[PDB]
Symmetry: C4
């Protein structure tokens, strides 16, 4: 009976904190006197995993089944509709009982009023079979067309599909690290494919209800008596050619329901393609930002060069210095060491340094190693004046190899990475 309560996962510990907050939430669920269903429990997961599959199945199969087929009295179609109505009614019954993340777990007052205020009507319309009631209660062709238009009320399950998809993918940013633009662009691709699939069925459906006039494209292309696969292929081609702004037929369209459907599909396709270009741009601009911020910083540097009118050899020397200091990449070594915790910084220092001070109290050694600084030099650029202590990591130094010190005229022969521990910090560590 603990399936209604939230368990102890990585997600529950990231949301609530320690195990004590999770046990407080479990006692809070068990304290409201009901069979209350917590929205992070396993039961909602196992239920919505079934419901998303049934939603995708219905939203793909139902327009093709309504429009293209002739006799709607086949047995597996009726079985399919009855089972879909049963599950989408039980999901409404459980939506009476679930918790709402704003977590409002008060069953008799908060959940009922919040569900009746926001999303009861759309789920109630999309749940029950409306057409079969009118068939039991009740010029037969007008009745059949009216029942087809009533049976197209099943497509209001998209408002539930969007809600459950947004809930699960809002959960799954915390269990796993995900790029946001990828999630947004695949959500948009799914929406675009679903809209194109609906426009195909709609552009066959509208000449269908008029008993195929001689002006429509179906009668012109002489394709009334083919199979449903051929008709679906041509209708989907027509819908995709209107959606991607192509230009379909020989003539301009003649009938009045053709013109307005054409214009509607053109507007929907143009807006969807504009949002697709926007998501593609937002995804491309976040691939190599570390190689872009360095470029902007070097633009500012050469602007500083141009403001003071420096000679050309000095400018190419600055260029070589930044190439061998940052290596085409932007990072701030002060703030990164500022943000971290202390023994993890001790680990990073014990990896990088603390092997160069092997020659000549461990806590004294760690304090000296924390008191260091990183420097990059250049050949010809001599560092000492005749009349601050260094260590050598790389490069050549003439007055040597990797690893030495200058105990208190030294010229750099190549690119050298050095360290420094200048005597004020050393005296502070001696005081410690």
């Amino acid at each position: 009976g603990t399936l209604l309560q939230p368990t102890v996962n990585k997600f529950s510990l990231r949301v609530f904190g320690s195990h004590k907050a999770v046990e407080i939430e479990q006692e809070r669920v068990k304290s409201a006197g009901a069979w209350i269903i917590h929205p992070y429990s396993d039961f909602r997961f196992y239920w919505d995993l079934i419901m998303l599959l049934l939603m995708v199945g219905n939203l793909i199969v139902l327009p093709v089944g309504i429009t293209f087929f002739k006799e709607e009295n086949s047995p597996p179609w009726i079985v399919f509709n009855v089972l879909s109505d049963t599950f989408f009614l039980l999901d409404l019954v459980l939506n009476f009982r679930t918790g709402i993340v704003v977590e409002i777990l008060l069953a008799p007052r908060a959940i009922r009023t919040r569900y009746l205020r926001t999303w009861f009507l759309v789920d109630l319309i999309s749940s029950i079979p409306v057409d079969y009631i009118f068939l039991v209660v009740e010029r037969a062709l007008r009745i059949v067309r009216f029942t087809k238009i009533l049976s197209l009320l099943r497509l209001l399950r998209l408002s539930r599909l969007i809600r459950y998809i947004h809930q699960w993918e809002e959960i799954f940013h915390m269990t796993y690290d995900l790029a946001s633009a990828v999630v947004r662009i695949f959500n948009l691709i799914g929406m675009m494919l679903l809209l194109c699939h609906w426009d195909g069925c709609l552009q066959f459906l509208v000449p269908m209800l008029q008993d195929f006039p001689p002006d429509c494209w179906v009668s012109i292309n002489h394709m009334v008596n083919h199979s449903w696969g051929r008709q679906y292929s041509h209708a989907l081609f027509k819908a995709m050619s209107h959606m991607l702004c192509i230009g379909y037929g020989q003539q301009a369209p003649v009938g009045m329901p053709d013109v307005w459907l054409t214009m509607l599909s053109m507007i929907v396709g143009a807006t969807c393609y504009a949002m697709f270009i926007g998501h593609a741009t937002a995804l491309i601009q976040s691939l190599d930002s570390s190689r872009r911020q360095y470029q902007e910083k070097y633009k500012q540097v050469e602007q500083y060069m141009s403001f003071h009118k420096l000679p050309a050899d000095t400018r190419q020397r600055i260029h070589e210095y930044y190439e061998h200091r940052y290596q085409g990449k932007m990072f701030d070594e002060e703030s990164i060491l500022g943000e971290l915790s202390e023994p993890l910084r001790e680990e990073i220092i014990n990896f990088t340094c603390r092997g160069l001070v092997a020659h000549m109290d461990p806590s004294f050694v760690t304090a000296v190693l924390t008191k260091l600084r990183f420097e990059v030099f250049q050949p010809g650029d001599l560092v000492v004046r005749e009349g601050k202590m260094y260590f050598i990591q790389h490069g050549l130094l003439s007055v040597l190899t990797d690893g030495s010190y200058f105990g208190e005229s030294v010229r750099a022969d190549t690119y050298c990475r050095l360290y420094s521990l200048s005597v004020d910090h050393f005296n502070a560590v001696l005081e410690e």
Copy 2:
């Protein structure tokens, strides 16, 4: 008589300041000797609310009424034009008297010269009925076509509609918080729909004035003697197919007014669709910026990892530390507490802290609570050396539960959020 003066609203207090500045502005309006109209008063609001509705009504109805209908001597059309001319003349009379935000409320000198210099001519042209004067003063078909082209001068009210819309939506950024890109993109959508509606009427209007030559599309499609709804539908379809860059008919266009109108509508549609893509991109890039700045910062962090060639276990340990420190979100807790005022920071501290120091002078307690710091640790990462005081918010610590202190070998067993009050700040508070 106080309707001409600005009242005391949320907007007036955000603009001018206290009530004293508002009373100074009211005395300034009452001191200029006139019936001067202040541009933030209620009278301009109640006037422009009527004028925007009349502008939308005229700019939708008038091209359809001029082009498609045959006899323009129906009585309600003349009544509609007379009432529109009356209101758009009275609006000119009141635009002589209004104040101008640059607020220049000097009536006889500043307002008259500024209005005559900038926008008197366009409002004067779009105000008066030009066609009826030529009809009273004055080959009859050329006269009727000339009066239609003169009656198309009513469409210079768009320059007033743009001005009033920009004034009100510049006001309504301060009464309510609004995203800027939403306002920009709905302004562009309104402009695009209005331009498409005008291109439809224009592409029926140009074959209309030539007594329908046999080369034009109206004579080819055999649609001279249909109703005006059918003709408007086909003309709007042709205009939208040129605007969205489709490709309309079987043949290339033949007549010379067809080719240049076609090219003009193609260029206008291409530029409008490019600006729509630009606004859509600018709106998409401002949805999840807090989830993007964290991504860029972590790119810089892993670049810092790659610059010093750290081992893989240390890199995944940094990754886990940032996941459980920032939780996929960028914020700077130092600058946010820097920007705020002092007792509001005392409120935030009294909510978060000041319950953990419940065990063991209230001002002393508030000073100690302001002297705290926030820390996040990791399991295995022990924090103390044998031979600074902490508090526990979450996690487990072995040598415990949530809430304890280390009064002056402690190992973190899980993710722990701790506090710190190191003895220098404590001695400063003891000095206070």
Copy 3:
């Protein structure tokens, strides 16, 4: 004779500095022994103003004059070509003598070698009349077509037009403040219009050289014997329909020069329209950046709210505080006062402050006024504890009106903007 030397303008003082650097540059021009022409002088300006007009005139008139007209032996055409050849030869002669901004004013060595290395050949080809030489030196229709293809070598003046336009608009960023994206987008619009105008003439030119085969569109549309205006209109419509990716005719194109010209114009139009979308996006993203950085900062603030799980009343109180502190706008008052000079800051302080300290040594007053700080409070938020001095700019305070002080239980009744001069800074000013 001083027209060859740079004068004293706003631009010369912004580039070189004081008048002494300008006089050094004038002596440098007069010291190189030549009639050397400095590239910032008035003579190059007055010369290039003529040359840009002749370039636009030639690059518009010459393709229409070559392709559509039949007899090329009219007198004003020959006069026009002779005068154009004369001016574009004299411009080459002066390009031997001008200075080069890299300013290299050394005449006999630097300028000649740099001009012969980079851009001598293209200007030499586009300068001289090539076709008339072949006409004097030399199946007549092949000769006429060959002279037309040789006379199309005049269109290599675009490489000079681009160079002079970039030089002048690089100059005119410093004389006047200009948005960069506006300059870029109008340069692109000019290039796109010129390319479309060339594609029209080219798509009439290619069927022209083949003596109008029956497969081409000119023979199909029966438009060989119309005037040149009709043919230019249809050719430009065909070129613009290929460029904006429309779909032109009934059939697919049949001949082989039609297909490759069609594909070439489609590729050029697609790339130009993509760069136009890019420039439009870059222009839109730089209109309301100050209203966007505030939005991003408030996203970070509400993220900081969500990280610590604050109550709702505190969150809306932070929201009201930022609305009445920054007013939907981002600025940093510390760094702006950091960047400025000292007496200008004294001017800003003497405007804002120094009227509130009117009640109760002027240098002492200026030091106290520099030692102030700006604060914003909130109603209910009382500021003093029973048992730092303030000034009042706005709001109401109960224990008052605008302008008072607290000389060393005060409750804010409304939004209050206050000042502060806490006693350490006051003691430092007393020490001064």
Copy 4:
């Protein structure tokens, strides 16, 4: 035998460091007991330079050779296929032996398992001639069509081409400074051209296998018995018209393989063009960032002006100050001097300063020159009060010329750039 080992280049010194790390890597390659091939050596470079040329040659020639030609038994075709199979088998043999940058140079364990896990199958399929085996082992037209479909398995060499191109261009960001967006956009242009070239051959290939039905476009346009150049031109035109979303023929397509190929090419072309717009936008936004950050900063400055309601003369004075301080360009002179090394800063100071202190111990002079600060003033803005030392670089000062000092009422007549060395720093240098 040292060609398998990495040599000493600029790239090897930038990657590994000094010469000692390179010699350690050479001893590491020579210590694994094999003929192991290091992935940065010269041998992989000289091998992949041949392999990229063979890949481009095969991926251009093979679809045109399979589809359009009739008899595939010509001798140079068989020689070409045999040589291509030989080289792409030897490349597999060497891919067994190469090192893998993750550098894993362990031959018998790491490389074999990593290559068998990731990319053995695709290279094995694309290496061997599959069709000739079925021809040796084995209604003849079905056999010929089946061998053509088997011989189209050679096009899985694109997965190797992408890998080698990404490896070399990841190497060549470090040998030379390159803009990233240029590399990305030319990679995308190459991919788009290759996909269009494949769609042309595919849209001729599909009617080819059906023995040219009368519904297809080849039989309609009466182009079965032309040469292969004409057929390739029309097929590539059809593929490019579907890819750029044009609208190709008179009728809608009739056959079922036509419709789905048409829709597939439309979707691929739309996605490629959207990514091209994204790369073009990302390239345009990185051209003039230094002229954009100044614009954003000045927006913040004028917002700070509007927040405090400053007079207009003060606002234009701030505008003139920023124009003559930053010159339309953003840079931070403190952080740039912070990032650099010390003797290079001494070089920059010795260029800019140290000529103005020529009048009135060299180390003392360098310390005073490091203790300076840069200031910009304005005419009318007098700087001294009657009752800090300066130097003059430009401008005029009345109580002069360029270069003077104020040894401890001076009015600036023009724009002046000055220096400062205020007495605390001078006393510190005297202490040094």
